[PDB]
């Protein structure tokens, strides 16, 4: 039972760190998407 | 019985001892850590999981 409860502790820690990474990557991806759209519009205007 | 009469004894000869009275076997500290882990995992169960 001690091994299994320690297994759950490490499982929950890995779960929380995975969600932290997932939020970080999703936030970065959304910011990059919006920035890319803005940069595309800016480049099209400048080229024209 | 022993020898011919009762064995000599000191006038007080208390010697309380009796540190343990039966039981023994399973230790209490290991299961104390077990119970602490039990309440800790219950507190974790209170915290949200999944979703």
Curated annotation (Swiss-Prot), chain A:
Per the UniProt record, the source organism is: Saccharomyces cerevisiae (strain ATCC 204508 / S288c) (Baker's yeast)
- Top-level taxon of origin: Eukaryota
Q: Give the residues of the full protein shown.
A: 922 to 969 of 1114
Q: Per the entry's comment, what about the domains?
A: The flexible hinge domain, which separates the large intramolecular coiled coil regions, allows the heterotypic interaction with the corresponding domain of SMC5, forming a V-shaped heterodimer.
What does it do?
A: Acts in a DNA repair pathway for removal of UV-induced DNA damage that is distinct from classical nucleotide excision repair and in repair of ionizing radiation damage. Functions in homologous recombination repair of DNA double strand breaks and in recovery of stalled replication forks. Probably plays a role in structure.
| Subunit and partners | Component of the Smc5-Smc6 complex which consists of KRE29, MMS21, NSE1, NSE3, NSE4, NSE5, SMC5 and SMC6.
Where is it localised? Nucleus; Chromosome
Q: Which family is this sequence assigned to? A: Belongs to the SMC family. SMC6 subfamily.
Q: Can you name this protein?
A: Structural maintenance of chromosomes protein 6
- Other comments on record: Present with 339 molecules/cell in log phase SD medium.
UniProtKB/Swiss-Prot annotation, chain B:
Location of the protein in the cell: Nucleus; Cytoplasm
Functional description taken from the UniProt entry: Acts in a DNA repair pathway for removal of UV-induced DNA damage that is distinct from classical nucleotide excision repair and in repair of ionizing radiation damage. Functions in homologous recombination repair of DNA double strand breaks and in recovery of stalled replication forks.
Q: How does it assemble?
A: Component of the Smc5-Smc6 complex which consists of KRE29, MMS21, NSE1, NSE3, NSE4, NSE5, SMC5 and SMC6. Interacts with NSE5.
Provide the protein name: DNA repair protein KRE29
**Gene source species:** Saccharomyces cerevisiae (strain ATCC 204508 / S288c)
Q: Which residues of the full protein are shown?
A: 105 to 155 of 464
